[PDB]
Amino acid sequence: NVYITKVSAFMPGNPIDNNTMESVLGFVGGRPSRSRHIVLRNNGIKYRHYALDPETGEATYTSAQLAAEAVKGLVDEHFSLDDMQSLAASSGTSDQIIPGHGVMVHGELKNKPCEVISTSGACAAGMTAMKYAYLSVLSGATSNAVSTTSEVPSTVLHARNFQSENEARVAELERRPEIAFEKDFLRWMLSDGAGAALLENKPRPDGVSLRIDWIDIYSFANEQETCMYSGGEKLADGSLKGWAQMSQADWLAYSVFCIKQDVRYLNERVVKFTLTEPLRRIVADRNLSSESIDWFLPHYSSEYFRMKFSEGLDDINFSIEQERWFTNLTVKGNTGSASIYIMLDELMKSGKLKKDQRLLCFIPESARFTGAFMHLTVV
Amino acid sequence: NVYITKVSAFMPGNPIDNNTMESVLGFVGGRPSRSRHIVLRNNGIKYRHYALDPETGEATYTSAQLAAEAVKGLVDEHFSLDDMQSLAASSGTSDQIIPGHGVMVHGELKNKPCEVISTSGACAAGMTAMKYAYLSVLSGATSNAVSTTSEVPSTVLHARNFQSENEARVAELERRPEIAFEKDFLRWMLSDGAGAALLENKPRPDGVSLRIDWIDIYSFANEQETCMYSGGEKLADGSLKGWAQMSQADWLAYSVFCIKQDVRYLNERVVKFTLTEPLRRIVADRNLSSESIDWFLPHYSSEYFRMKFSEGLDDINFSIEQERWFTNLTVKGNTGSASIYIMLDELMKSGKLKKDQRLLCFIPESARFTGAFMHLTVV
């Protein structure tokens, strides 16, 4: 058996409300975003955090530093950093391409030499890191394991990531160039945060531990196109052209390293190919009952999709009523891969969990349509 | 138990010799490299492969395509792609930052929806992906799993990746317009290739399988600096500055996205902090004797380090003489994370493996000093 015995969340700086967030992320071409208003109206997020200094605008934490803060939050009398037998770390916004994120987090933590692995991707990468840690303990390879994820998309959403594209279109004499909606959209969706979990082969003697019953993950990339992407451009045939296949000049003129979202494709396919297609396989294969679930922990990212996902549950005959849904999206921000840790941290410290309650965690990844699901039991 | 029942290797195109390699990777600033000759003299590599067309210079395989080719080599009458219960993929040279490499491999293979995970890093990412697959089967979570890794450094070692820096050094009136050795070094070291392995909970009825006894991995990033890096710059204080903290103009002026090596740090520290320090822990914890090893499969990258790693074995009383070493580095090139797959593929196909033989695989990663070790037994 494997038990989550400690969770930790780390949000950089103070919550930033809707009227302040654009001043933090800057103007492109000296002009404010035309779509920020409606993007915010649709997603419903009221506060979020950025690893950006409120006065100077300097970065306050690298991605590696942010993960390290979340990991340090696991330390108590029962666990010190030198106790960890394996560290699995992810970040969709790693500070560098090489080395991997995890060894940079190890460099920040400076705990004694141990196994460090990094997983990659977007929102689901936090769950593939957790599943690595889970399999390590479940197989007996270790007695404990730590997984952690961090997101600092502020680094790439800041207006400066579009300056050379603006200047390029100004040199094409274009009058009022605006970056594409595909490029501006995520600036008002994604924000900064980090989480960590300690997994052990025994529950704590005191207090609650969440037994991991299984973690099931499905990719639908075999038939779905790339939908969220950075360091590349999506072509007309739906394929993704990687950055090193484009001229250096084109990296700057087209903001190739910014995060982009194929929003119409997202809208059309996210519910089916991150929720209903994987969950119906999981329900049937594990003989699941919608009513056995006391807590549904969905990372639905945007108020716009909350009831769309809920209708997906209905369509596969797995309805879960809103009274059993737990999230803090509106107040914490969409922290991507860190969202499920930020949700678990709050629920677990809240005092609302009771022994034998069953939790279903749902982590979609629109990058190329992965659905990650985790079933927990309170002990 | 877990058994490697099939290994696959894919080398792109035709072997490319020492005289032809620079014509494939191009001149920076219209001049041949001044370091190429000595670098090649020390690394002793005589052939390598690039995912580049020798005639047209166009990319012949993306990283995702190269890994997909490797995975398709696992297919026979005992395994089709749709039987894989989990895919763990890595690339130190992924085509993009988001999505993760693995789901791009899945989109190329187009096998039916399954679990896909991506690990990140450099040389050891191939072994963290393989350890994920191994833990999946060992824990019972799946009865099989596939690990794969691909490297196309040709994408980033081609002269075009230093075009803007050469322009900036020319425009700055530098005495020497050539790029620094730290940026040119790896152009003659790294090359392209992919590997894949099928892991099952039963050996193959026909012929030999490799039981995985253990996979032990250690990071020394807690006290060693970044040594191989890309998407960032190493600062004088030894820290790494990520690419998004640098100006867009500096990405181009300083080739921030090319792969760099701190060669003096590498030479000083690679044997101790990828070989002797992790292996002396493993030897002590598992009471290993070198006498029990029938084949040593080390990824030593360079002829210059072959007997420096040997001396490292000597210092920890784990000496293994050269007649027990297996490599094809000289003929295959240094394919990074793929090297272990390309070594194991040749050896399993050689006919030289006898039942009950024990294999010790060693995969160092200089990026920030990880050592990965796998113990195998022929069944």
PDB file of C-alpha atoms in Angstrom, chain A residues 94-336:
ATOM      1  CA  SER A  94      11.080  24.593 -16.423  1.00  0.00           C
ATOM      2  CA  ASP A  95      13.761  27.273 -16.150  1.00  0.00           C
ATOM      3  CA  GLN A  96      15.954  25.600 -18.773  1.00  0.00           C
ATOM      4  CA  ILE A  97      15.815  22.857 -21.380  1.00  0.00           C
ATOM      5  CA  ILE A  98      18.823  20.941 -19.986  1.00  0.00           C
ATOM      6  CA  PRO A  99      19.274  19.910 -17.138  1.00  0.00           C
ATOM      7  CA  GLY A 100      15.938  18.410 -16.203  1.00  0.00           C
ATOM      8  CA  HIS A 101      13.788  20.304 -13.735  1.00  0.00           C
ATOM      9  CA  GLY A 102      14.181  17.757 -10.939  1.00  0.00           C
ATOM     10  CA  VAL A 103      17.951  17.971 -10.571  1.00  0.00           C
ATOM     11  CA  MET A 104      17.635  21.773 -10.424  1.00  0.00           C
ATOM     12  CA  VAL A 105      15.117  21.360  -7.559  1.00  0.00           C
ATOM     13  CA  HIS A 106      17.620  19.001  -5.902  1.00  0.00           C
ATOM     14  CA  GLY A 107      20.297  21.686  -6.333  1.00  0.00           C
ATOM     15  CA  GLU A 108      18.072  24.168  -4.490  1.00  0.00           C
ATOM     16  CA  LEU A 109      17.079  21.790  -1.667  1.00  0.00           C
ATOM     17  CA  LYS A 110      20.668  20.550  -1.112  1.00  0.00           C
ATOM     18  CA  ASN A 111      19.451  17.392   0.632  1.00  0.00           C
ATOM     19  CA  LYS A 112      21.857  14.441   0.521  1.00  0.00           C
ATOM     20  CA  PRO A 113      22.369  12.561  -2.782  1.00  0.00           C
ATOM     21  CA  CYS A 114      19.251  10.650  -3.755  1.00  0.00           C
ATOM     22  CA  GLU A 115      17.310   9.420  -6.763  1.00  0.00           C
ATOM     23  CA  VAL A 116      15.913  12.358  -8.748  1.00  0.00           C
ATOM     24  CA  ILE A 117      13.640  11.995 -11.751  1.00  0.00           C
ATOM     25  CA  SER A 118      11.928  14.676 -13.836  1.00  0.00           C
ATOM     26  CA  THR A 119       8.687  14.292 -15.758  1.00  0.00           C
ATOM     27  CA  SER A 120       7.558  16.617 -18.484  1.00  0.00           C
ATOM     28  CA  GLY A 121       4.417  17.855 -20.164  1.00  0.00           C
ATOM     29  CA  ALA A 122       1.777  20.282 -18.900  1.00  0.00           C
ATOM     30  CA  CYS A 123      -0.968  19.783 -16.254  1.00  0.00           C
ATOM     31  CA  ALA A 124      -0.704  15.992 -16.251  1.00  0.00           C
ATOM     32  CA  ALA A 125       3.058  16.050 -15.637  1.00  0.00           C
ATOM     33  CA  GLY A 126       2.371  16.656 -11.963  1.00  0.00           C
ATOM     34  CA  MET A 127       0.391  13.430 -11.951  1.00  0.00           C
ATOM     35  CA  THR A 128       2.979  11.375 -13.846  1.00  0.00           C
ATOM     36  CA  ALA A 129       5.533  12.505 -11.266  1.00  0.00           C
ATOM     37  CA  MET A 130       3.125  11.455  -8.515  1.00  0.00           C
ATOM     38  CA  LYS A 131       2.529   8.113 -10.223  1.00  0.00           C
ATOM     39  CA  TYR A 132       6.296   7.519 -10.451  1.00  0.00           C
ATOM     40  CA  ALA A 133       6.526   8.151  -6.701  1.00  0.00           C
ATOM     41  CA  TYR A 134       3.492   5.921  -6.194  1.00  0.00           C
ATOM     42  CA  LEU A 135       4.944   3.013  -8.201  1.00  0.00           C
ATOM     43  CA  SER A 136       8.288   3.359  -6.402  1.00  0.00           C
ATOM     44  CA  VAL A 137       6.606   2.746  -3.046  1.00  0.00           C
ATOM     45  CA  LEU A 138       3.987   0.284  -4.343  1.00  0.00           C
ATOM     46  CA  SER A 139       6.659  -1.957  -5.877  1.00  0.00           C
ATOM     47  CA  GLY A 140       8.721  -1.845  -2.683  1.00  0.00           C
ATOM     48  CA  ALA A 141      11.670  -0.139  -4.403  1.00  0.00           C
ATOM     49  CA  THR A 142      11.431   2.528  -1.675  1.00  0.00           C
ATOM     50  CA  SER A 143       9.599   3.099   1.611  1.00  0.00           C
ATOM     51  CA  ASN A 144       8.774   6.700   0.762  1.00  0.00           C
ATOM     52  CA  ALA A 145       8.942   9.059  -2.206  1.00  0.00           C
ATOM     53  CA  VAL A 146       8.273  12.743  -2.828  1.00  0.00           C
ATOM     54  CA  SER A 147       6.608  14.145  -5.911  1.00  0.00           C
ATOM     55  CA  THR A 148       6.486  17.854  -6.659  1.00  0.00           C
ATOM     56  CA  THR A 149       5.477  20.178  -9.468  1.00  0.00           C
ATOM     57  CA  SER A 150       5.835  23.893 -10.007  1.00  0.00           C
ATOM     58  CA  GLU A 151       4.524  26.430 -12.500  1.00  0.00           C
ATOM     59  CA  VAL A 152       5.844  29.937 -13.180  1.00  0.00           C
ATOM     60  CA  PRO A 153       4.160  30.796 -16.514  1.00  0.00           C
ATOM     61  CA  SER A 154       4.547  34.461 -15.503  1.00  0.00           C
ATOM     62  CA  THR A 155       8.046  34.021 -16.984  1.00  0.00           C
ATOM     63  CA  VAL A 156       6.630  33.506 -20.484  1.00  0.00           C
ATOM     64  CA  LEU A 157       3.267  35.347 -20.252  1.00  0.00           C
ATOM     65  CA  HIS A 158       4.930  38.692 -19.502  1.00  0.00           C
ATOM     66  CA  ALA A 159       4.555  41.206 -22.351  1.00  0.00           C
ATOM     67  CA  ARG A 160       8.308  41.133 -22.976  1.00  0.00           C
ATOM     68  CA  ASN A 161       7.825  37.684 -24.551  1.00  0.00           C
ATOM     69  CA  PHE A 162       6.016  39.394 -27.417  1.00  0.00           C
ATOM     70  CA  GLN A 163       8.106  42.563 -27.863  1.00  0.00           C
ATOM     71  CA  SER A 164      10.143  41.328 -30.854  1.00  0.00           C
ATOM     72  CA  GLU A 165       6.968  40.183 -32.591  1.00  0.00           C
ATOM     73  CA  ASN A 166       5.472  43.660 -32.061  1.00  0.00           C
ATOM     74  CA  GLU A 167       8.625  45.353 -33.381  1.00  0.00           C
ATOM     75  CA  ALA A 168       8.624  42.959 -36.364  1.00  0.00           C
ATOM     76  CA  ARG A 169       5.117  43.980 -37.411  1.00  0.00           C
ATOM     77  CA  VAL A 170       5.927  47.654 -36.797  1.00  0.00           C
ATOM     78  CA  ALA A 171       8.789  47.216 -39.288  1.00  0.00           C
ATOM     79  CA  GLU A 172       6.167  45.814 -41.695  1.00  0.00           C
ATOM     80  CA  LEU A 173       4.573  49.249 -41.248  1.00  0.00           C
ATOM     81  CA  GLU A 174       1.505  47.542 -39.759  1.00  0.00           C
ATOM     82  CA  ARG A 175      -0.564  50.119 -37.921  1.00  0.00           C
ATOM     83  CA  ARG A 176      -1.794  48.622 -34.633  1.00  0.00           C
ATOM     84  CA  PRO A 177      -0.371  45.108 -34.435  1.00  0.00           C
ATOM     85  CA  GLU A 178      -1.998  42.893 -31.831  1.00  0.00           C
ATOM     86  CA  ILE A 179      -0.738  39.448 -30.904  1.00  0.00           C
ATOM     87  CA  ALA A 180      -3.087  36.639 -31.899  1.00  0.00           C
ATOM     88  CA  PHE A 181      -5.821  35.574 -29.487  1.00  0.00           C
ATOM     89  CA  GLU A 182      -4.121  32.165 -29.450  1.00  0.00           C
ATOM     90  CA  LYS A 183      -1.146  33.958 -27.834  1.00  0.00           C
ATOM     91  CA  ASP A 184      -2.987  36.438 -25.592  1.00  0.00           C
ATOM     92  CA  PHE A 185      -5.530  33.945 -24.217  1.00  0.00           C
ATOM     93  CA  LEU A 186      -3.310  32.087 -21.792  1.00  0.00           C
ATOM     94  CA  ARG A 187      -1.931  35.321 -20.312  1.00  0.00           C
ATOM     95  CA  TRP A 188      -5.208  35.700 -18.403  1.00  0.00           C
ATOM     96  CA  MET A 189      -5.654  31.950 -17.677  1.00  0.00           C
ATOM     97  CA  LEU A 190      -2.380  30.593 -16.231  1.00  0.00           C
ATOM     98  CA  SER A 191      -0.578  31.668 -13.069  1.00  0.00           C
ATOM     99  CA  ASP A 192       2.086  30.583 -10.599  1.00  0.00           C
ATOM    100  CA  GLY A 193       2.113  27.973  -7.839  1.00  0.00           C
ATOM    101  CA  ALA A 194       3.809  24.804  -6.595  1.00  0.00           C
ATOM    102  CA  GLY A 195       2.896  21.698  -4.634  1.00  0.00           C
ATOM    103  CA  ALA A 196       4.494  18.612  -3.121  1.00  0.00           C
ATOM    104  CA  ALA A 197       3.367  15.289  -1.640  1.00  0.00           C
ATOM    105  CA  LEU A 198       5.042  12.777   0.648  1.00  0.00           C
ATOM    106  CA  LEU A 199       4.091   9.166  -0.107  1.00  0.00           C
ATOM    107  CA  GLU A 200       4.833   6.352   2.367  1.00  0.00           C
ATOM    108  CA  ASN A 201       4.075   2.653   2.715  1.00  0.00           C
ATOM    109  CA  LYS A 202       2.342   3.291   6.090  1.00  0.00           C
ATOM    110  CA  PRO A 203      -0.174   5.936   7.186  1.00  0.00           C
ATOM    111  CA  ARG A 204       0.801   8.395   9.894  1.00  0.00           C
ATOM    112  CA  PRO A 205      -0.182   7.212  13.403  1.00  0.00           C
ATOM    113  CA  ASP A 206      -1.770  10.622  14.012  1.00  0.00           C
ATOM    114  CA  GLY A 207      -4.204  12.403  11.718  1.00  0.00           C
ATOM    115  CA  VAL A 208      -5.412  11.501   8.223  1.00  0.00           C
ATOM    116  CA  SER A 209      -3.535   9.875   5.365  1.00  0.00           C
ATOM    117  CA  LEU A 210      -4.977   9.384   1.897  1.00  0.00           C
ATOM    118  CA  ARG A 211      -4.455   5.889   0.582  1.00  0.00           C
ATOM    119  CA  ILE A 212      -3.781   5.825  -3.148  1.00  0.00           C
ATOM    120  CA  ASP A 213      -5.944   3.064  -4.571  1.00  0.00           C
ATOM    121  CA  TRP A 214      -4.857   3.634  -8.182  1.00  0.00           C
ATOM    122  CA  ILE A 215      -3.723   6.279 -10.679  1.00  0.00           C
ATOM    123  CA  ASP A 216      -5.001   5.724 -14.221  1.00  0.00           C
ATOM    124  CA  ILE A 217      -3.761   7.829 -17.137  1.00  0.00           C
ATOM    125  CA  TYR A 218      -4.754   7.836 -20.818  1.00  0.00           C
ATOM    126  CA  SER A 219      -3.345   9.774 -23.746  1.00  0.00           C
ATOM    127  CA  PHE A 220      -5.545  10.416 -26.775  1.00  0.00           C
ATOM    128  CA  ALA A 221      -2.730  11.920 -28.854  1.00  0.00           C
ATOM    129  CA  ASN A 222      -3.078   9.007 -31.311  1.00  0.00           C
ATOM    130  CA  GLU A 223      -6.001  10.861 -32.935  1.00  0.00           C
ATOM    131  CA  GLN A 224      -6.174  14.337 -31.362  1.00  0.00           C
ATOM    132  CA  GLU A 225      -4.039  17.249 -32.538  1.00  0.00           C
ATOM    133  CA  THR A 226      -1.678  19.298 -30.393  1.00  0.00           C
ATOM    134  CA  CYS A 227      -3.813  21.916 -28.636  1.00  0.00           C
ATOM    135  CA  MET A 228      -1.526  23.697 -26.150  1.00  0.00           C
ATOM    136  CA  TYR A 229       2.072  24.210 -27.199  1.00  0.00           C
ATOM    137  CA  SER A 230       5.221  26.280 -26.691  1.00  0.00           C
ATOM    138  CA  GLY A 231       8.545  26.215 -28.454  1.00  0.00           C
ATOM    139  CA  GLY A 232       6.773  25.473 -31.704  1.00  0.00           C
ATOM    140  CA  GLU A 233       4.007  26.515 -34.077  1.00  0.00           C
ATOM    141  CA  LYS A 234       0.940  24.567 -35.138  1.00  0.00           C
ATOM    142  CA  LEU A 235       0.759  24.292 -38.927  1.00  0.00           C
ATOM    143  CA  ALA A 236      -2.265  24.184 -41.244  1.00  0.00           C
ATOM    144  CA  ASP A 237      -2.292  20.370 -41.381  1.00  0.00           C
ATOM    145  CA  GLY A 238      -2.546  20.310 -37.565  1.00  0.00           C
ATOM    146  CA  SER A 239       1.008  19.109 -36.993  1.00  0.00           C
ATOM    147  CA  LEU A 240       3.451  20.944 -34.718  1.00  0.00           C
ATOM    148  CA  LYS A 241       6.652  22.439 -36.123  1.00  0.00           C
ATOM    149  CA  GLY A 242       9.368  22.482 -33.472  1.00  0.00           C
ATOM    150  CA  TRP A 243      11.353  25.616 -32.717  1.00  0.00           C
ATOM    151  CA  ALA A 244      14.735  24.329 -33.910  1.00  0.00           C
ATOM    152  CA  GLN A 245      13.110  23.798 -37.342  1.00  0.00           C
ATOM    153  CA  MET A 246      12.501  27.567 -37.619  1.00  0.00           C
ATOM    154  CA  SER A 247      15.001  30.348 -38.202  1.00  0.00           C
ATOM    155  CA  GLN A 248      16.263  32.219 -35.159  1.00  0.00           C
ATOM    156  CA  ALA A 249      14.682  35.360 -36.592  1.00  0.00           C
ATOM    157  CA  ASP A 250      11.298  33.580 -36.723  1.00  0.00           C
ATOM    158  CA  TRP A 251      11.567  32.646 -33.005  1.00  0.00           C
ATOM    159  CA  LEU A 252      11.431  36.357 -32.187  1.00  0.00           C
ATOM    160  CA  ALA A 253       9.113  37.537 -34.968  1.00  0.00           C
ATOM    161  CA  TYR A 254       6.484  34.902 -34.135  1.00  0.00           C
ATOM    162  CA  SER A 255       7.016  34.467 -30.355  1.00  0.00           C
ATOM    163  CA  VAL A 256       7.700  30.754 -30.884  1.00  0.00           C
ATOM    164  CA  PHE A 257       8.612  30.254 -27.207  1.00  0.00           C
ATOM    165  CA  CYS A 258       5.361  31.702 -25.852  1.00  0.00           C
ATOM    166  CA  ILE A 259       2.554  29.373 -24.738  1.00  0.00           C
ATOM    167  CA  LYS A 260      -0.255  29.064 -27.303  1.00  0.00           C
ATOM    168  CA  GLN A 261      -3.701  27.435 -27.195  1.00  0.00           C
ATOM    169  CA  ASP A 262      -5.795  26.233 -30.133  1.00  0.00           C
ATOM    170  CA  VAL A 263      -8.912  27.505 -28.368  1.00  0.00           C
ATOM    171  CA  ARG A 264     -11.561  26.339 -30.861  1.00  0.00           C
ATOM    172  CA  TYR A 265     -10.085  22.816 -30.852  1.00  0.00           C
ATOM    173  CA  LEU A 266      -9.884  22.879 -27.040  1.00  0.00           C
ATOM    174  CA  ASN A 267     -13.559  23.907 -26.826  1.00  0.00           C
ATOM    175  CA  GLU A 268     -14.609  21.122 -29.183  1.00  0.00           C
ATOM    176  CA  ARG A 269     -12.598  18.192 -27.818  1.00  0.00           C
ATOM    177  CA  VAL A 270     -11.460  18.755 -24.223  1.00  0.00           C
ATOM    178  CA  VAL A 271     -14.463  17.214 -22.447  1.00  0.00           C
ATOM    179  CA  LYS A 272     -14.607  14.075 -24.582  1.00  0.00           C
ATOM    180  CA  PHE A 273     -10.869  13.401 -24.834  1.00  0.00           C
ATOM    181  CA  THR A 274      -9.720  14.343 -21.346  1.00  0.00           C
ATOM    182  CA  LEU A 275     -12.755  13.254 -19.280  1.00  0.00           C
ATOM    183  CA  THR A 276     -15.399  11.042 -20.860  1.00  0.00           C
ATOM    184  CA  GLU A 277     -13.256   8.787 -23.075  1.00  0.00           C
ATOM    185  CA  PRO A 278     -10.731   7.841 -20.340  1.00  0.00           C
ATOM    186  CA  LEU A 279     -13.198   7.786 -17.469  1.00  0.00           C
ATOM    187  CA  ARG A 280     -15.631   5.449 -19.200  1.00  0.00           C
ATOM    188  CA  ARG A 281     -12.755   3.007 -19.733  1.00  0.00           C
ATOM    189  CA  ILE A 282     -11.773   3.406 -16.085  1.00  0.00           C
ATOM    190  CA  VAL A 283     -15.345   3.061 -14.745  1.00  0.00           C
ATOM    191  CA  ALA A 284     -16.007  -0.093 -16.760  1.00  0.00           C
ATOM    192  CA  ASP A 285     -12.560  -1.612 -16.140  1.00  0.00           C
ATOM    193  CA  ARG A 286     -12.680  -0.994 -12.348  1.00  0.00           C
ATOM    194  CA  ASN A 287     -16.488  -1.375 -11.935  1.00  0.00           C
ATOM    195  CA  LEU A 288     -16.930   2.097 -10.433  1.00  0.00           C
ATOM    196  CA  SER A 289     -20.079   3.595  -8.904  1.00  0.00           C
ATOM    197  CA  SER A 290     -20.704   7.330  -9.163  1.00  0.00           C
ATOM    198  CA  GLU A 291     -22.318   7.239  -5.717  1.00  0.00           C
ATOM    199  CA  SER A 292     -19.293   5.765  -3.930  1.00  0.00           C
ATOM    200  CA  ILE A 293     -17.427   9.069  -4.490  1.00  0.00           C
ATOM    201  CA  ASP A 294     -17.576  11.478  -1.541  1.00  0.00           C
ATOM    202  CA  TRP A 295     -15.178  14.048  -3.035  1.00  0.00           C
ATOM    203  CA  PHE A 296     -14.594  14.916  -6.701  1.00  0.00           C
ATOM    204  CA  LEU A 297     -11.428  16.966  -7.236  1.00  0.00           C
ATOM    205  CA  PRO A 298     -11.539  18.282 -10.819  1.00  0.00           C
ATOM    206  CA  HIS A 299      -8.960  20.563 -12.388  1.00  0.00           C
ATOM    207  CA  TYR A 300     -11.367  22.167 -14.871  1.00  0.00           C
ATOM    208  CA  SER A 301      -9.249  25.374 -15.240  1.00  0.00           C
ATOM    209  CA  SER A 302     -12.075  27.713 -16.188  1.00  0.00           C
ATOM    210  CA  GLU A 303     -15.590  28.439 -14.948  1.00  0.00           C
ATOM    211  CA  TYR A 304     -16.555  28.142 -18.630  1.00  0.00           C
ATOM    212  CA  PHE A 305     -15.845  24.383 -18.580  1.00  0.00           C
ATOM    213  CA  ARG A 306     -17.119  23.430 -15.096  1.00  0.00           C
ATOM    214  CA  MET A 307     -20.599  22.459 -16.251  1.00  0.00           C
ATOM    215  CA  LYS A 308     -19.309  21.227 -19.610  1.00  0.00           C
ATOM    216  CA  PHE A 309     -17.255  18.608 -17.773  1.00  0.00           C
ATOM    217  CA  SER A 310     -20.276  17.910 -15.555  1.00  0.00           C
ATOM    218  CA  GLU A 311     -22.391  17.146 -18.633  1.00  0.00           C
ATOM    219  CA  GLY A 312     -19.621  14.826 -19.763  1.00  0.00           C
ATOM    220  CA  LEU A 313     -20.058  12.966 -16.494  1.00  0.00           C
ATOM    221  CA  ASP A 314     -23.795  12.766 -17.269  1.00  0.00           C
ATOM    222  CA  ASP A 315     -23.196  11.465 -20.808  1.00  0.00           C
ATOM    223  CA  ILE A 316     -21.204   8.480 -19.475  1.00  0.00           C
ATOM    224  CA  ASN A 317     -23.755   7.843 -16.670  1.00  0.00           C
ATOM    225  CA  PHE A 318     -21.344   8.920 -13.911  1.00  0.00           C
ATOM    226  CA  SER A 319     -23.068  12.070 -12.667  1.00  0.00           C
ATOM    227  CA  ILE A 320     -21.582  13.733  -9.613  1.00  0.00           C
ATOM    228  CA  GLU A 321     -23.514  16.636  -8.195  1.00  0.00           C
ATOM    229  CA  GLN A 322     -21.826  19.956  -7.622  1.00  0.00           C
ATOM    230  CA  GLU A 323     -22.158  19.583  -3.823  1.00  0.00           C
ATOM    231  CA  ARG A 324     -19.420  16.912  -3.971  1.00  0.00           C
ATOM    232  CA  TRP A 325     -17.017  18.992  -6.146  1.00  0.00           C
ATOM    233  CA  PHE A 326     -14.085  20.628  -4.351  1.00  0.00           C
ATOM    234  CA  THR A 327     -11.880  23.314  -5.898  1.00  0.00           C
ATOM    235  CA  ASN A 328     -10.181  26.590  -5.014  1.00  0.00           C
ATOM    236  CA  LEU A 329      -9.542  27.629  -8.639  1.00  0.00           C
ATOM    237  CA  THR A 330     -11.346  30.971  -8.291  1.00  0.00           C
ATOM    238  CA  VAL A 331      -9.096  32.182  -5.482  1.00  0.00           C
ATOM    239  CA  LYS A 332      -5.761  30.381  -6.123  1.00  0.00           C
ATOM    240  CA  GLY A 333      -5.607  30.678  -9.914  1.00  0.00           C
ATOM    241  CA  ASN A 334      -5.119  28.006 -12.550  1.00  0.00           C
ATOM    242  CA  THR A 335      -1.675  26.762 -11.584  1.00  0.00           C
ATOM    243  CA  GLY A 336      -1.672  23.989 -14.197  1.00  0.00           C
TER     244      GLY A 336
END
